[PDB]
Amino acid sequence: TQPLITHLIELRKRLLNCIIAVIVIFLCLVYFANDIYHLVSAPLIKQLPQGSTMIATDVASPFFTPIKLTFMVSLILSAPVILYQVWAFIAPALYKHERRLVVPLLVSSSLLFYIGMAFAYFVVFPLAFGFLANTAPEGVQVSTDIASYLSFVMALFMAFGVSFEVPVAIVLLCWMGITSPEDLRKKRPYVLVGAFVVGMLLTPPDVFSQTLLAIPMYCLFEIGVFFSRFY
C-alpha cells in the first residue's frame, strides 16, 4: 500500500472512466459516421469549384476516415469527462482552497473550446474554403482527398479552440494575483521562441508549417497582454 501505489490505483480508475466515456459516445455516433462527415465536409463542398469533387486516394479511406472523425468527435464531446477525472485525481493535492476557483474555470475553459470550433466552422471555414478552393493555378484540378481534409479540419478546430482560451487565460492570470502586464511584456522574446518550439511539436516536419502556426500564438499572446491592461 502507501502512496505511489494508490495514486495509480486512482489514476487507473480515472483512466477507465475516460476510456468508457470515449467508447460509449463513439458507439452511439458510430452509425452516423457519414452524417458527421457530411456536416464537416459541407463548408468545403459548397465552396468547391464546378466539376471538382472530393476523392479518396487511400483504399480504406472511404470507411476508416468517417470512423476516424467519429472517434475524434467523441474525444471532444467527452472532454468535460476527461478533464473532470484529471481534476479529481489532482483534487486531493488542491485542498489549499484553490479547488473552489478551478471548478468553474475548467467549466469555462470548456465552452471556449467549443465556441472556437463553432467560430471556425461557421465564420472561418466558409471564408477559408471559399478562397483556398478557387485559387488553384491554371490547369490544376482541385480534387481534395477526404483523408487530408480531416487532418486540415482537426488542425483548424484545435488551433481555434486553443486560440480562444489563450487571451482569457492571460487576462485571468494577470487579473487577480499571478502576473501583471509588465511581466508578460518582458517575457515577449521568450514566447516567440516558445511559440516556434510549441508549433514545431504540433506541426508536421515542415519548416513552412511551424513558421505559419507559431505566429498566431504570438499574436494571441499579444492581444491578451493588451486586454489585461484594460482591467
Binding site: 502507501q2 516567440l192 513558421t211
Partner: protein, 63 residues
C-alpha cells in the same frame, strides 16, 4: 515523437539567436537544461520509491 525535423530545429536556433542574442540565449539553454535535470531528478526518485514500495511491502508480509 512530436514530428521532429532538421530545418525545424535549425529555425529555433536561428530564430532564438536573433531574438535573444548572445546574452539571453545561453541562459535559456541553461534554464531549459535545468528543467530536464528536474525531470530526471523526479524520474530517478519516483522509480526508486516505486520499487521501494512494491518489493518491501510484499516481502514484509512474507516475514
Amino acid at each position: 515523437m512530436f514530428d521532429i525535423g532538421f530545418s525545424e530545429l535549425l529555425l529555433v536556433f536561428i530564430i532564438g539567436l536573433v531574438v535573444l542574442g548572445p546574452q539571453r540565449l545561453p541562459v535559456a539553454v541553461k534554464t531549459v537544461a535545468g528543467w530536464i535535470r528536474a525531470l530526471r531528478s523526479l524520474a530517478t526518485t519516483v522509480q526508486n520509491e516505486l520499487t521501494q514500495e512494491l518489493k518491501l511491502q510484499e516481502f514484509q508480509d512474507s516475514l
